[PDB]
Specification:
This is part of a larger assembly, with chains A (324 residues), B (135 residues) and C (32 residues). With 324 residues, chain A is an alpha+beta fold. Chain A has ten helices and eleven strands. The radius of gyration of chain A is 24 Å and the shape is globular. Chain C is mainly alpha-helical. The chains are: A alpha+beta (324), B mainly alpha (135), C mainly alpha (32). At the A-C interface, strand 5 of A face helix 1 of C. It is classed as ribosome. The entry lists the keywords ribosome, ArfA, RF2, trans-translation, 70S, 50S, 30S, rescue termination, cryo-EM.
Chain lengths: 324, 135, 32
């Protein structure tokens, strides 16, 4: 536990060469009034100052609770130092808060998201896989005090679900699920094949943040859809029984999609001017779950599936942050 | 002659990041002013901002006289709040008693250009109200 | 991009040969 704590704290030290030098540079050139005369410069300094400020308040805990621990924590935990060992619980909490902060703060990360789950090849098996995936995300939402709004659900004929599109709203939703987005691989002995040979099926997970008058048509099938024709992507809703609400819901999803199409394209263009495989796998035979990206493996698949692993997500988030 | 009040926490040594060389826009050096501030501080508590007159003469040696601690900070300190209010009329974040305000008022009397402390108290109350705290 | 990627072959369904199974018969063993 102590070792773990130390490790955690080491990350915090990792942002000491950033904070000091940066701060010095800012005061030396940016703080100046004759530099200030240009707005852009001022803005830059403010951004730079923000970095400094984060490092100030949260490092104290790392330093202050570390140095004061060892004198009283050494020999006694149970008698007289039962406060003094769970005094470092506070430190742990602080550390966690810091880490989480580092992970988040990035563009659109607070605004809720609407993940579509798409199956892969396998046909019947694949649909089941999709369903399973959906279930896990639902449980994650449940776990994390969220409220899920079920928009698209479409059953596959032989078994399972073909297509789904599920929208959760609450406290930093997108942030958590934004990494997941991509292919999830189901490496397990099919219940449908009599042979019981191991199979591999897949699932895309499209995850997007939530964020014309004659070039859209709205058609009823009490069901509803909002087909923005110029781009050419449709959305279809079936959540509520009341029509107007459903329509409204559809509208927001479509809007989100529009934004998504724009932003990614723009980014690509910029890159032009200037993962390969599955992200995750779940290997039920082996009781074994490798995220291929970020090199973590959980050995209780069931736990992961029942309710999605926050820890894994955090790791993924960290990786994403680093890449950013 | 270049007199302006513009600074932060007195106790923290050499606060160059918030304002810093604005006082040093004129011919007086950055080192001096900071030093002066530091000197001033030892007579009073650290952590709070303070304003001071900046009469920048041609000789490069400047006269200076402190004023009372910022109205706002003082007001806050009796309240026991960091963030005062965002949207105060819609919901109250905190509140103050009048006696405390009155007490606060009396200690500033030297810098406060007024004889009646009652007036000062009422001003303080008004300020508090503005901030977002129903007396 | 997500959709087509899924469609592409690298994500085709994989099945494995069997060692004591039905389609097992290895004419020549891995090693001599």
């Amino acid at each position: 536990n102590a070792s773990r704590n130390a490790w955690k704290a080491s990350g915090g030290i990792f942002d000491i060469p950033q904070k000091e030098t940066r701060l010095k540079e800012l005061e030396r050139r940016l703080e100046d009034p004759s530099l200030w005369n240009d707005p852009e410069a001022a803005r830059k300094v403010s951004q730079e100052a923000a970095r400094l400020r984060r490092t100030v308040d949260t490092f104290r805990s790392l330093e202050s609770d570390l140095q004061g621990l060892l004198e009283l924590m050494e020999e006694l935990p149970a008698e007289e130092r039962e406060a003094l060992k769970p005094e470092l619980e506070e430190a742990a909490k602080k550390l966690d808060e810091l880490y989480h902060q580092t992970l988040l703060n990035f563009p659109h990360a607070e605004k809720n998201a609407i993940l579509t789950i798409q199956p892969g090849a396998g046909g019947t098996e694949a649909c089941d896989w999709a369903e399973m995936l959906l279930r896990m995300y639902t449980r994650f939402a449940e776990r994390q005090g969220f409220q899920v709004e079920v928009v698209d659900l479409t059953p596959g004929p032989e078994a399972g679900i073909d297509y789904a599109q599920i929208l959760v709203k609450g406290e930093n939703a997108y942030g958590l699920l934004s990494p997941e987005a991509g292919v999830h691989r189901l490496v397990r002995p099919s219940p449908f094949d009599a042979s019981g040979r191991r199979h591999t099926s897949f699932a895309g997970v499209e995850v997007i943040p939530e964020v014309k008058p004659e070039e859209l048509r709205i058609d009823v099938m009490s069901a509803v859809r909002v087909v923005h024709l110029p781009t050419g992507i449709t959305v279809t809703c079936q959540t509520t029984r009341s029509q107007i609400k459903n329509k409204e819901l559809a509208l927001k999803i479509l809007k989100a999609r529009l934004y998504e199409l724009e932003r990614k394209k723009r980014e690509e263009e910029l890159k032009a001017l200037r993962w390969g495989s599955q992200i995750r796998s779940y290997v039920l035979d082996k009781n074994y779950v490798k995220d291929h990206r970020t090199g973590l493996m959980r050995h209780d698949p069931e736990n992961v599936l029942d309710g999605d692993l926050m820890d894994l997500i955090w790791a993924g988030l960290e990786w994403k942050a680093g890449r950013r | 002659q270049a007199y302006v009040k513009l600074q932060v926490a007195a106790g923290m040594a050499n606060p160059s990041p918030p304002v810093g060389p604005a006082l040093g826009q004129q011919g007086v050096n950055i080192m001096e002013f900071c030093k002066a501030f530091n000197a001033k501080t030892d007579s009073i508590e650290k952590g709070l901002p303070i304003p001071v007159v900046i009469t920048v003469y041609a000789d490069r040696s400047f006269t200076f006289v402190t004023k009372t601690p910022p109205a706002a900070v003082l007001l806050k300190k009796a309240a026991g709040i960091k963030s005062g209010s965002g949207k105060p009329n819609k919901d109250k974040v905190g509140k103050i008693s009048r006696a405390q305000l009155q007490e606060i008022a009396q200690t500033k009397a030297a810098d406060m250009t007024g004889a009646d402390i009652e007036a000062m108290t009422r001003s303080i109350e008004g300020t508090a109200r503005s901030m977002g705290l129903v007396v | 991009a997500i959709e087509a990627l899924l469609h592409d072959p690298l994500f085709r369904q994989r099945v494995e040969k069997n060692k004591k199974g039905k389609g097992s018969y290895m004419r020549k063993g891995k090693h001599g």
